[PDB]
């Protein structure tokens, strides 16, 4: 190999070497090598990367050089033959809530971020790749096939630039291309606590000596408190209303207002760590604010993790859960707790679960005014709607009363995402997520269908007839191969989502054994995972066995009746029992006493 250490925006310090907490960027988890799982450091690789020049160059850059032996067909157009549909009815979860669908968006946040090449303040660049779609350097433009309706109506091409990578940002020598993921690779509520020490800070409340995140001062919630304004101009959020003037929200990850939803959730994170910790005083009014913080951020670190493994994961993963996530047996320092490149995109599964449309609900889960439902693409970075227009009660209400949306192999991505997309860099509602998915795939050198089924252990189809068994669909087959000439220039993100769904889950074998592995890995490689001996007492995991997401709303929010399985599909009134009959966390093992 070479240079076993490239360097970049590579913060500062060493470890504390005996502290409880963890640090901020991650680093100091693991004792023989820091910076593992460390933020901002390369994406791990699972299998070496695959460029057109095995260097740098993605596949489908130059319209010439094939992947073996075929050229690979344009992104939208895989997009407009395989991943579109109109007709949105009979597409929900019968059995998946909302929040099903957002919660996967909060742990994906939590664990990689691959930012865009920046290069691009008082640029013209962007202007090259936007107006004339003029492929670059980092201007990589997903062009529009022939007879494509946004031509008439957009334009040639979606700009899209290609994601940053290690040793410098200006590129091309020396190694094969790894892209950065900067936030924490543990899952360790970093998208509330930021993963660089300088934000981190910018975040919290240290004019009181209380341990509280900073909260928003122009606005409130009936008394419950927001995220703090981003003051950033110009901003993506007072562009879709310039009449209502509201900012993005500020949290711990960039991306929290990108649709009202994550925003809600963020928020309710947010109320979480000021209750934990002004409940964390009462108990030891000898605590300073250090300890305040700290103590509050472990245990909703904690909470995320249980939530996750407890909850979300049995049911994304099925009867594959045991295959891939045995039972706890205590921290590996032999295992590698990075995040790989393929996990970014296998865990896009969740793009297919996205539905049309979100609802408000009063407080007897009856639509909330006269627009009570609003289709999700006027939701993009859409803050004013919850500021100025009910808070985020009745959307909580809507995460538990409504549907995610089911993967459907004839209807795979809908038309919020799929057509009308808004990027906070550009002005219009027209990009297409299934488009950039594909792109990226081939920006960040992935890995073919087989290869990965391969790593998986799984039968390689090679014709026709074999990929029909494997997507057990005779003309699913016929599409992906009329447009990829054989399955092993599928890309992963496609060729992992086609496949049928394993029993009890919401993935299929190839994507259960990608997430399977990655989530087994976070857990057995961090030191400070809630099941070690020693991170937290017997008495507080006995207490912290307990949390659920149905409590978390009724502490943070002024709903009274949840359901006991938030994830699930629960029915209104059946389903729904009063906050009195939901488990509390119990804070007393946390109570310290003095002499
Ligand atoms: C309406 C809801 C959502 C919207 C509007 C949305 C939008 C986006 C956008 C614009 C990107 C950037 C893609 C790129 O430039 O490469 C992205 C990336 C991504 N999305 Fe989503 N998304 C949504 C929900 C979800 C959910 C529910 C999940 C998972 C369960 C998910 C998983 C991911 C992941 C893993 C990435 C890449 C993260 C990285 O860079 O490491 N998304 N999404
Ligand atoms: C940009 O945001 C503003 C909100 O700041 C939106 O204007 C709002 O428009 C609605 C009706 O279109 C107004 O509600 C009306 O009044 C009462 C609500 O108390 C209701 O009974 C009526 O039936 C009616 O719906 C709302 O007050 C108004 N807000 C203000 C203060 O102007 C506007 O819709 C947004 N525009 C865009 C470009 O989306
Ligand atoms: C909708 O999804 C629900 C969430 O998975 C699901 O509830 C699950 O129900 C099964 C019942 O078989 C439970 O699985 C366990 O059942 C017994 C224990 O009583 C054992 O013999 C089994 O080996 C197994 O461990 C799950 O615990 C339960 N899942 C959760 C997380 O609550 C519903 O069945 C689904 N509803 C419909 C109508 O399909
Ligand atoms: C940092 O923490 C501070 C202490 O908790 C907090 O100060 C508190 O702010 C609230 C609201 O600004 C004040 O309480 C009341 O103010 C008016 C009455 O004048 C009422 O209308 C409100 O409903 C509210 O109850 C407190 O006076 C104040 N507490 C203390 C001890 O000074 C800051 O808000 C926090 N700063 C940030 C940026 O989050
Ligand atoms: C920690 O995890 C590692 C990595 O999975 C395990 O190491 C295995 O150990 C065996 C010998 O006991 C080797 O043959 C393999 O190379 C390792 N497995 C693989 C495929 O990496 C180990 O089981 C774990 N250690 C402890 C103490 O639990
Ligand atoms: C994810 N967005
Ligand atoms: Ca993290």
């Given at each position: 190999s070479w240079e076993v250490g490239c360097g970049a925006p590579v913060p500062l310090v060493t470890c504390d070497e005996q502290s409880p907490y963890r640090t901020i960027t991650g680093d100091c988890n693991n004792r023989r090598s820091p910076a593992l799982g460390a933020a901002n450091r390369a994406l791990?690789?699972?299998?070496?990367?695959?460029?057109?020049?095995?260097?740098?160059?993605?596949?489908?850059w130059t319209q010439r050089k094939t992947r073996n032996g075929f050229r690979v067909p344009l992104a939208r157009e895989v997009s407009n033959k395989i991943v579109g549909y109109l007709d949105e009815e009979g597409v929900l979860d019968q059995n998946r809530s909302l929040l099903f669908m957002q919660w996967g968006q909060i742990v994906d946040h939590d664990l990689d971020f691959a930012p865009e090449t920046e290069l691009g303040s008082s640029e013209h660049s962007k202007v090259q790749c936007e107006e004339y779609c003029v492929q670059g350097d980092e201007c990589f433009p997903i062009m529009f096939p022939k007879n494509d309706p946004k031509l008439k109506t957009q334009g040639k091409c979606m700009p899209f630039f290609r994601a940053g990578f290690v040793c410098p940002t200006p590129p091309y020598q020396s190694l094969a291309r790894?892209?950065?993921?900067?936030?924490?690779?543990?899952?360790?509520?970093?998208?509330?606590?930021?993963?660089?020490?300088?934000?981190?800070?910018?975040?919290?409340?240290?004019?009181?000596?209380?341990?509280?995140?900073?909260?928003?001062?122009e606005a409130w919630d009936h008394g419950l408190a927001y995220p703090p304004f981003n003051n950033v101009k110009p901003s993506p959020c007072e562009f879709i209303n310039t009449t209502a003037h509201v900012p993005c929200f500020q949290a711990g990850d960039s991306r929290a207002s990108e649709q009202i939803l994550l925003a809600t959730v963020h928020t309710l994170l947010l109320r979480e760590h000021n209750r934990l910790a002004r409940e964390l005083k009462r108990l030891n009014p000898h605590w300073d604010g250090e300890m305040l913080y700290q103590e509050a951020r472990k245990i909703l670190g904690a909470f995320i993790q249980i939530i996750t493994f407890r909850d979300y994961l049995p049911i994304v993963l099925g009867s594959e859960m045991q295959k891939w996530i045995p039972?706890?047996?205590?921290?590996?320092?032999?295992?590698?707790?990075?995040?790989?490149?393929?996990?970014?995109?296998?865990?896009?599964?969740?793009?297919?679960e996205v539905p049309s449309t979100v609802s408000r609900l009063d407080e007897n889960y009856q639509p909330w005014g006269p627009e009570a439902e609003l289709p999700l693409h006027t939701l993009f970075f859409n803050t004013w709607?919850?500021?100025?227009?009910?808070?985020?009660?009745?959307?909580?209400?809507?995460?538990?009363?409504?549907?995610?949306?089911?993967?459907?192999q004839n209807?795979?991505?809908?038309?919020?995402?799929?057509?009308?997309?808004?990027?906070?860099?550009?002005?219009?509602?027209?990009?297409?997520?299934?488009?950039?998915?594909?792109?990226?795939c081939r920006d960040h050198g992935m890995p073919g269908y087989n290869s990965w089924r391969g790593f998986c252990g799984l039968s390689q189809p090679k014709t026709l007839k074999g990929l029909q068994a494997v997507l057990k669909n005779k003309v699913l087959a016929k599409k992906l191969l009329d447009l990829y000439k054989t399955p092993d220039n599928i890309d992963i993100w496609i060729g992992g989502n086609a496949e049928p769904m394993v029993e009890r889950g919401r993935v299929g074998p190839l994507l259960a054994c990608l997430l399977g592995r990655q989530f087994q890995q976070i857990r057995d490689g961090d030191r400070f995972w809630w099941?070690?001996?020693?991170?937290?007492?017997?008495?507080?995991?006995?207490?912290?066995?307990?949390?659920?997401?149905?409590?978390?709303?009724?502490?943070?929010?002024?709903?009274?009746?949840?359901?006991?399985?938030?994830?699930?599909?629960?029915?209104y009134p059946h389903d729904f029992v009063d906050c009195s009959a939901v488990d509390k966390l119990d804070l007393s093992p946390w109570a310290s006493r003095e002499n």
């Open positions: 791990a690789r699972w299998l070496p990367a695959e460029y057109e020049d095995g260097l740098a160059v993605p596949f489908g790894d892209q950065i993921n900067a936030v924490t690779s543990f899952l360790d509520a970093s998208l509330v606590y930021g993963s660089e020490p300088s934000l981190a800070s910018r975040l919290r409340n240290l004019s009181s000596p209380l341990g509280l995140m900073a909260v928003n001062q039972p706890y047996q205590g921290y590996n320092n032999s295992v590698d707790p990075r995040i790989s490149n393929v996990f970014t995109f296998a865990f896009r599964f969740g793009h297919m709607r919850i500021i100025k227009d009910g808070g985020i009660d009745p959307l909580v209400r809507g995460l538990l009363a409504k549907n995610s949306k089911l993967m459907n209807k795979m991505v809908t038309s919020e995402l799929r057509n009308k997309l808004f990027q906070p860099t550009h002005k219009v509602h027209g990009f297409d997520l299934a488009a950039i998915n594909l792109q990226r099941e070690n001996p020693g991170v937290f007492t017997e008495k507080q995991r006995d207490s912290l066995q307990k949390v659920s997401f149905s409590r978390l709303i009724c502490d943070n929010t002024h709903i009274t009746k949840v359901p006991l399985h938030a994830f699930q599909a629960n029915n």
